[PDB]
Amino acid sequence: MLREFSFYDVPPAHVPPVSEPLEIACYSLSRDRELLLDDSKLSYYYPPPLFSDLNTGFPNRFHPPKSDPDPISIVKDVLMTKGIQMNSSFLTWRGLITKIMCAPLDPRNHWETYLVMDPTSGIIMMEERTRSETSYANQDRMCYWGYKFEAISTLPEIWDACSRDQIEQRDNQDVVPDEQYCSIVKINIGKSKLILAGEVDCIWDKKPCSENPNLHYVELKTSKKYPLENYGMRKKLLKYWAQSFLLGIGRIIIGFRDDNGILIEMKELFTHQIPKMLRPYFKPNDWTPNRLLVVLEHALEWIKQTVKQHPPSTEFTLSYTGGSKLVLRQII
């Protein structure tokens, strides 16, 4: 079977209820591309000097990131090793929800995911199996600017516990984006219960004793600066909001750079501030945070109801190749 979901066919509705993303597990990844069940790779935000050259170390000190997509079994395995029960409708990578959510904003960005309902739990698991369109630019200079900004903006310990050499020698460190800290989150969007995993760039202060940690987390971005009148800038900020919203990340820090890769300015945002900040600049027919949530909730319910009409272990493909439609296919 083949089913289509139109972004346009979704009627005006109230914004769906969205719960506070609760962390249920976390883990660390190393440069050799192995996983550890600890806070080993958790880092802390501390800014670089302004006019930092984000080219430094490209490509001689650059450890290029993995290009093949990670199977979602990785997260399933983490949770089961920890004896955490999965009682939700979806298990996937946070980035895969962002892609569904923001598809209407990016007609040029094509993607495909695989969906399978687990016969034991009833959870729908989603992953990519083919190298993504986005990953092909994985090691471009401009992508490096982002990895570089993250390397020179984080510390292995809190500011006070770090020597000044540790802080000041960050420009000379290898850039190793495979080394990361990750958060696994429960989040409800309408009637859909989701377990999502994503990279956490750093933390603002420290992880609370046990309080949910996610509002303490920070996302780091690099971008050219434009005024909010520029639609491209609004769209980018909206996509920044969507990504962090899904893991309940508290802050987004943007390193604004010029055309040559020099860091010229930094801007701290609260994730929940973005919708209000963008509101005055919206015109009729524009995609807003609320409309993106309404259409996502409808997309998720459509996927769920379709998948549940078939036996477990049936493979499905969800494709976006431009246009106003998502395409869901049963694999025979």
Partner 1 sequence: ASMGVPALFRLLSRKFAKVITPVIEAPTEKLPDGTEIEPDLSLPNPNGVECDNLYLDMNGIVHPCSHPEDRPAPETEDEMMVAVFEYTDRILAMVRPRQLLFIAIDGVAPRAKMNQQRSRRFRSSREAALKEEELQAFIEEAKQQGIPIDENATKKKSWDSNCITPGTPFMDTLAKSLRYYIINKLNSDPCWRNVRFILSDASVPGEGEHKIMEFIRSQRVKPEYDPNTHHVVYGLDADLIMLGLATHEPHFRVLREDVFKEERLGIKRLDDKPFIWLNVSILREYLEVELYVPNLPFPFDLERAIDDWVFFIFFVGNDFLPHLPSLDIRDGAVERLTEIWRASLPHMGGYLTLDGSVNLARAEVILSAVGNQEDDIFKRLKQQEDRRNDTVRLYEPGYRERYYEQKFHISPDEPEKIREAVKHYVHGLCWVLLYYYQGCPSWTWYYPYHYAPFAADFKDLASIDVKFELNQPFKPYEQLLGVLPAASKNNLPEKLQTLMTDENSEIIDFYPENFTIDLNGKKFEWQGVALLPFIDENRLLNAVSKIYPQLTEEESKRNEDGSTLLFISEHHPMFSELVKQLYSKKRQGKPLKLSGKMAHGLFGKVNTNDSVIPNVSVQCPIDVTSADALQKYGSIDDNQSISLVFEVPKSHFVHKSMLLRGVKMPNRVLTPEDINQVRAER
Q: In the chain, which ranges are E strands? A: 2-6, 22-29, 35-36, 44-45, 90-93, 111-117, 124-127, 154-155, 180-189, 192-200, 202-203, 217-223, 251-257, 263-270, 315-320, 325-330
Only one residue has tokens 């309902």, namely 117
Of residues 108, 111, 88, the one with CA closest to residue 98: 111
- Rule CB under 8 A: which of 38-77 touch partner 1? 44-47, 49
- The annotated binding site for substrate is made up of 33, 93-95, 182, 199, 221, 243
How many binding residues for Mg ion (CB under 5 A)? 2
Min separation Cβ 161 and partner 1, Å: 6
Compare residues 151 and 318 and give the one whose CB is closer to Mg ion: 151
Min separation Cβ 65 and Mg ion, Å: 12
Burial class (CB in 10 A: 0-12, 13-18, 19+), 277: middle
d(CA 261, CA 141): 9
- Rule CB under 8 A: which of 143-202 touch partner 1? 158-161, 164, 167-168
Segment interacting with Mg ion, rule: CB under 5 A, options 49-57, 81-89, 214-222, 297-305? 214-222
CA distances, 126 to each of 90, 196, 212 (Å): 8, 10, 25
- The annotated binding site is made up of 33, 93-95, 150, 182, 199, 201, 219-221, 243
Compare residues 52 and 244 and give the one whose CB is closer to partner 1: 52
Min separation Cβ 222 and Mg ion, Å: 8
Q: Is 220 in the site for Mg ion (CB under 5 A)?
A: yes
CB 94 within 8 A of CB 239: no
Compare residues 127 and 150 and give the one whose CB is closer to Mg ion: 150
Joined together, the tokens standing for residue 140 give 């471009």
Which residues bind to partner 1, rule: CB under 8 A?
A: 44-47, 49, 158-161, 164, 167-168, 204-206, 208-209, 211, 268
Site residues, Mg ion (CB under 5 A): 201, 220
